[PDB]
Design an enzyme around this catalytic site. Structure first.
Site, PDB file in Angstrom:
ATOM      1  N   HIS B 119      34.833  42.711  34.405  1.00 53.49           N
ATOM      2  CA  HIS B 119      33.813  41.685  34.770  1.00 53.49           C
ATOM      3  C   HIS B 119      32.749  42.224  35.753  1.00 53.49           C
ATOM      4  O   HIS B 119      31.901  41.415  36.177  1.00 53.49           O
ATOM      5  CB  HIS B 119      34.493  40.383  35.244  1.00 53.49           C
ATOM      6  CG  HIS B 119      35.475  39.781  34.278  1.00 53.49           C
ATOM      7  ND1 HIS B 119      36.336  38.771  34.651  1.00 53.49           N
ATOM      8  CD2 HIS B 119      35.673  39.978  32.946  1.00 53.49           C
ATOM      9  CE1 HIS B 119      37.030  38.378  33.601  1.00 53.49           C
ATOM     10  NE2 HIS B 119      36.613  39.100  32.533  1.00 53.49           N
ATOM     11  N   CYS B 127      21.699  52.236  36.354  1.00 53.43           N
ATOM     12  CA  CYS B 127      20.358  52.543  35.772  1.00 53.43           C
ATOM     13  C   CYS B 127      20.366  52.074  34.311  1.00 53.43           C
ATOM     14  O   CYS B 127      21.262  52.499  33.570  1.00 53.43           O
ATOM     15  CB  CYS B 127      20.028  54.030  35.877  1.00 53.43           C
ATOM     16  SG  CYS B 127      18.283  54.463  35.610  1.00 53.43           S
TER      17      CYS B 127
HETATM   18  N1  LIG Z   1      49.044  35.456  47.005  1.00 54.20           N
HETATM   19  C1  LIG Z   1      49.116  35.047  45.624  1.00 54.20           C
HETATM   20  N2  LIG Z   1      50.190  35.420  44.887  1.00 54.20           N
HETATM   21  C2  LIG Z   1      50.362  35.140  43.535  1.00 54.20           C
HETATM   22  N3  LIG Z   1      49.421  34.334  42.869  1.00 54.20           N
HETATM   23  C3  LIG Z   1      48.380  33.979  43.616  1.00 54.20           C
HETATM   24  C4  LIG Z   1      48.209  34.297  44.975  1.00 54.20           C
HETATM   25  N4  LIG Z   1      47.044  33.713  45.315  1.00 54.20           N
HETATM   26  C5  LIG Z   1      46.512  33.121  44.242  1.00 54.20           C
HETATM   27  N5  LIG Z   1      47.343  33.252  43.207  1.00 54.20           N
HETATM   28  C6  LIG Z   1      47.264  32.758  41.770  1.00 54.20           C
HETATM   29  O1  LIG Z   1      46.364  33.737  41.166  1.00 54.20           O
HETATM   30  C7  LIG Z   1      45.833  33.087  40.004  1.00 54.20           C
HETATM   31  C8  LIG Z   1      44.341  33.521  40.002  1.00 54.20           C
HETATM   32  O2  LIG Z   1      43.747  33.231  38.682  1.00 54.20           O
HETATM   33  P1  LIG Z   1      42.277  32.741  38.584  1.00 54.20           P
HETATM   34  O3  LIG Z   1      41.952  31.929  39.830  1.00 54.20           O
HETATM   35  O4  LIG Z   1      42.070  32.115  37.238  1.00 54.20           O
HETATM   36  O5  LIG Z   1      41.472  34.094  38.639  1.00 54.20           O
HETATM   37  P2  LIG Z   1      41.341  35.082  37.223  1.00 54.20           P
HETATM   38  O6  LIG Z   1      41.287  36.516  37.646  1.00 54.20           O
HETATM   39  O7  LIG Z   1      42.381  34.661  36.253  1.00 54.20           O
HETATM   40  O8  LIG Z   1      39.926  34.666  36.661  1.00 54.20           O
HETATM   41  C9  LIG Z   1      39.396  35.317  35.502  1.00 54.20           C
HETATM   42  C10 LIG Z   1      37.889  35.359  35.598  1.00 54.20           C
HETATM   43  O9  LIG Z   1      37.332  34.009  35.639  1.00 54.20           O
HETATM   44  C11 LIG Z   1      36.392  33.906  36.670  1.00 54.20           C
HETATM   45  O10 LIG Z   1      35.500  33.034  36.190  1.00 54.20           O
HETATM   46  C12 LIG Z   1      35.853  35.329  36.904  1.00 54.20           C
HETATM   47  O11 LIG Z   1      35.134  35.778  35.793  1.00 54.20           O
HETATM   48  C13 LIG Z   1      37.185  36.042  36.910  1.00 54.20           C
HETATM   49  O12 LIG Z   1      36.911  37.455  36.843  1.00 54.20           O
HETATM   50  C14 LIG Z   1      46.001  31.631  40.050  1.00 54.20           C
HETATM   51  O13 LIG Z   1      46.862  31.081  39.039  1.00 54.20           O
HETATM   52  C15 LIG Z   1      46.744  31.410  41.474  1.00 54.20           C
HETATM   53  O14 LIG Z   1      47.769  30.504  41.212  1.00 54.20           O
HETATM   54 ZN   LIG Z   2      18.556  56.822  35.662  1.00 56.38          ZN
END
Ligand SMILES: Nc1ncnc2c1ncn2[C@@H]1O[C@H](COP(=O)(O)OP(=O)(O)OC[C@H]2O[C@H](O)[C@H](O)[C@@H]2O)[C@@H](O)[C@H]1O
Ligand SMILES: [Zn+2]
Ligand SMILES: Nc1ncnc2c1ncn2[C@@H]1O[C@H](COP(=O)(O)OP(=O)(O)OC[C@H]2O[C@H](O)[C@H](O)[C@@H]2O)[C@@H](O)[C@H]1O
Ligand SMILES: O=C(O[C@H]1Cc2c(O)cc(O)cc2O[C@@H]1c1ccc(O)c(O)c1)c1cc(O)c(O)c(O)c1
Ligand SMILES: O=C(O[C@H]1Cc2c(O)cc(O)cc2O[C@@H]1c1ccc(O)c(O)c1)c1cc(O)c(O)c(O)c1
Ligand SMILES: [Zn+2]
Lengths: 282, 277
Positions: B119, B127
């Site tokens: 992402h 560039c």
């Molecule tokens: N300390 C922790 N330990 C374990 N789980 C945790 C902790 N803290 C938070 N969580 C969990 O961590 C999870 C975080 O999931 P999400 O929040 O969906 O982030 P993504 O990486 O999946 O988002 C994907 C893309 O969407 C976006 O739009 C961007 O494009 C991103 O790049 C949750 O279920 C929490 O319960």
């Molecule tokens: Zn260049």
């Protein structure tokens, strides 16, 4: 308790713009160099970058309660790492630039950082500490003891006693530990510089201590995202993240921020280590 | 923005202890291990997630604001971030797939040739002319693959652009190709702090299961694919990962501030293996 006034909760945050922030941290450098006896006062704001929520910030424990939501923890108290601010204060005590450390935090991370217990006052107690009712002997555990409000934990003293072990966590009506408050009182009064980091200064007598430094001509610096009870009495006010503030400060002082090798307890401060020579001022 | 703010699950102490022992066992017996990370591995450094109780989208939906307890520049790699540095260094980690834009994988010193940034990276500008990227010490200031107002210095003077995908923007074909290869040729895929609702990012761990790989899901909330998991751990990743490093007999190495390593260095020694049955 239910009735306890939780003072002002959820005030808007202030952000110094980057040229102002740079100039305020240099000025802080200047005060640390000129100052014979520096005391640090700390509060729940220095732990927020480790996933422990504050009391009275936008997502604070008391703030969320008041709007009917819950605080959120991103760690356990056992899995929580000391922040950069925590380790920068370890270093400043090692090289003899910190005289004393006064904390309102119960989160136990000053002790776990390795910071010496004979230069720290834990005004509100410590979730990893229990104390003999009978002999006053304190035990620093690897897990939270499990009770609050100076109640019985269910373990018995093992000094040769078998006294009742109790938590150190004050409730609203509980008198502050007289040993920790007296030491903190003396170190605040004999300070020529008191720096408050991540406290709103609303709890008495904890939040008044920095003010004792301003009698007979001391300087006060408040570092805080939100306003604080005493901003009026500050020589310097920095609106900024404590970790950004304290890494710029160590860089000005030519010191490094030391490694953390996991939980450790030091009873007694070790002899002072070398520190860089001072700039010329004026 | 998918399912936002589902309630959290917490494994009790004995079950949690037994699940991490078993993850240890899967790491010991696995040839080719991939780690799939998301925004959950950074919450213990004061960067909010997107879908957690207090995640960005979650707080938007409730018309409240997310809270940062740091800046992106001041944020420090977590225990989870440094344990993954160590596991790559001793050769127990084959490849790392991340959905995070927070830029801490790179700041942790993890090798770029073993990372896919699905992402983009808030510290990275590219560039448009010669495709050369630059890893900066501050966030580049724009999102959506827009011009940053700096120009190339390869001898080019081309237009430098942010790497942060928007909703309609295809994933970087290089990072997705190596991510897909690595996911397909693994025998163990472990997910850390991702809800797995974004496709194809959240579908990659599933490619491990084809021809009989195992999949471990480590998350506080539920996830799209809990159904396909061989192990599910309902725990803080720092606790999970610190206890895993202990079971493998490894140390969590020291962060010495922000550093970029382009190419993986040669594998370091690791402890010998337990007897398994
Ligand atoms: N300390 C922790 N330990 C374990 N789980 C945790 C902790 N803290 C938070 N969580 C969990 O961590 C999870 C975080 O999931 P999400 O929040 O969906 O982030 P993504 O990486 O999946 O988002 C994907 C893309 O969407 C976006 O739009 C961007 O494009 C991103 O790049 C949750 O279920 C929490 O319960
Ligand atoms: Zn260049
Ligand atoms: N990263 C940060 N950088 C700077 N400020 C911060 C940061 N994060 C939060 N803050 C601010 O840091 C300040 C935290 O203030 P409070 O939340 O009142 O905690 P206390 O230590 O003063 O509470 C004293 C006692 O009251 C309780 O009842 C217990 O008994 C406590 O022991 C706020 O203004 C935040 O804006
Ligand atoms: O104090 C204990 O609980 C923590 C969470 C909490 C809460 O959720 C509500 C509340 O009113 C007080 C409160 O106090 C702590 C806290 C909260 C916020 C912070 O910023 C901070 O640093 C520390 C505690 C103490 C023990 O001795 C135990 O054995 C034990 O099991 C728990
Ligand atoms: O992305 C930027 O800001 C953060 C806050 C945020 C938000 O409030 C809304 C949103 O859609 C995206 C978003 O992305 C970040 C974020 C948030 C949470 C995470 O977990 C995580 O890893 C990263 C960003 C990037 C730049 O280059 C800038 O110059 C700049 O000013 C901001
Ligand atoms: Zn006793």
């Amino acid at each position: 308790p239910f009735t306890a006034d939780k003072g002002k909760c959820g005030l808007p945050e202030i952000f110094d713009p980057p040229e102002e922030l740079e100039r305020k941290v240099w000025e802080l450098a200047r005060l640390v160099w000129q100052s014979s006896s520096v005391v640090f006062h700390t509060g729940a704001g220095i732990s927020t970058a480790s996933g422990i929520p504050d009391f009275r910030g936008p997502h604070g424990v008391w703030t969320m309660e008041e709007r009917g939501l819950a605080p959120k923890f991103d760690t356990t108290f056992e899995s929580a790492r000391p922040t950069q601010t925590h380790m920068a204060l370890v270093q400043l005590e090692r090289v003899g630039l910190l005289r004393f450390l006064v904390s309102q935090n119960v989160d136990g991370l000053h002790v776990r950082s390795g910071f010496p217990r004979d230069k720290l006052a834990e005004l509100h107690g410590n979730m990893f500490v229990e104390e003999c009712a009978k002999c006053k002997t304190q035990y620093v555990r690897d897990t939270v003891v499990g009770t609050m409000g100076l109640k019985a934990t269910g373990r018995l003293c093992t000094v040769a006693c078998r006294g009742e072990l109790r938590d150190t966590i004050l409730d609203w009506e509980d008198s502050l530990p007289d040993r920790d408050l007296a030491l903190a009182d003396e170190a605040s009064r004999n300070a020529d510089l008191s720096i408050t980091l991540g406290t709103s200064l609303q709890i008495r007598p904890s939040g008044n201590l920095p003010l004792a430094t301003k009698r007979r001509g001391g300087r006060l610096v408040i570092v805080n995202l939100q306003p604080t009870k005493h901003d009026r009495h500050a020589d310097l006010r920095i609106h900024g993240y404590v970790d950004e503030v304290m890494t710029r400060l160590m860089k000005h002082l030519g010191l490094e921020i030391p490694a953390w090798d996991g939980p450790r307890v030091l009873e007694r401060a070790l002899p002072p280590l070398p520190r860089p020579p001072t700039p010329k001022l004026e």
